[PDB]
C-alpha cells in the first residue's frame, strides 16, 4: 500500500489536492473538507502525538502510519530540487490533509475500497 500512497501523493500534487502544515490540516478539518489524513507515529515527538491523535480521530478519517517525520517530506516535495540525487535540506511534517479531487483513476477505486472497511 506504500506504492499506492506514493501514487495518491503524486496525484494530490498534480491536482493541487494537498494542504501542507498541521495548522492547514486543522483549518481543513474545521472547514469540513478532509478526505485522507496521514500520520506519523513512534517518532521524535514528546507530546505532539496525543494532540494529533485527538485532532485526527474526529470523523470519517482513515489512518496511515509513517515511521519517520523527516522522510515524509520527500514524497511531498518540500525542497524538491536536484532530482538526480538527493535534495539538500527537507523538513519533516506531521500531518497533511489530502484534498484529492481525483476519484476516477487506476488505483483510486482500490484504495477507496481498502479504506471503506
Amino acid at each position: 500500500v506504500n506504492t499506492a500512497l506514493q501514487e495518491v501523493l503524486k496525484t494530490a500534487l498534480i491536482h493541487d489536492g494537498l494542504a501542507r502544515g498541521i495548522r492547514e490540516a486543522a483549518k481543513a478539518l474545521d472547514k469540513r473538507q478532509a478526505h485522507l489524513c496521514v500520520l506519523a507515529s513512534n517518532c521524535d515527538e514528546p507530546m505532539y502525538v496525543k494532540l494529533v491523535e485527538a485532532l485526527c480521530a474526529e470523523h470519517q478519517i482513515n489512518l496511515i502510519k509513517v515511521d519517520d517525520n523527516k522522510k515524509l517530506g520527500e514524497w511531498v516535495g518540500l525542497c524538491k530540487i536536484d532530482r538526480e540525487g538527493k535534495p539538500r535540506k527537507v523538513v519533516g511534517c506531521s500531518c497533511v490533509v489530502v484534498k484529492d479531487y481525483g476519484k476516477e483513476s487506476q488505483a483510486k477505486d482500490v484504495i477507496e475500497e481498502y479504506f471503506k472497511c
Binding site: 486543522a26 483549518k27 472547514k31 505532539y48 496525543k50 485532532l55 480521530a57
Partner: protein, 68 residues
C-alpha cells in the same frame, strides 16, 4: 551606517514555540475545546480565531473590532 541620529530597529517578531499546540485543549476525550472565539464573518474563515488580549478580541485580515 551609524549616523548622528540613532535608527529605531524593526519589529523583531520573537519566535514563539508550541503555539499551534495551544489552540485546543487535550483531554481524555477526543473533542475540541478552543479558548478563542470564532470568526462569523466571511472575510476570515471558519478556522480563523481572534487575538487573546486583556480586554477585547481582534481579527486578523478582517481588521474588525468587536467590543462588548
Amino acid at each position: 551606517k551609524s549616523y548622528t541620529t540613532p535608527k529605531k530597529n524593526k519589529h523583531k517578531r520573537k519566535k514563539v514555540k508550541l503555539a499551534v499546540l495551544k489552540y485546543y485543549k487535550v483531554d481524555e476525550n477526543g473533542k475540541i475545546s478552543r479558548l478563542r472565539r470564532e470568526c462569523p464573518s466571511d472575510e476570515c474563515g471558519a478556522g480563523v480565531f481572534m487575538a487573546s488580549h486583556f480586554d477585547r478580541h481582534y481579527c486578523g485580515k478582517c481588521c474588525l473590532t468587536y467590543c462588548f
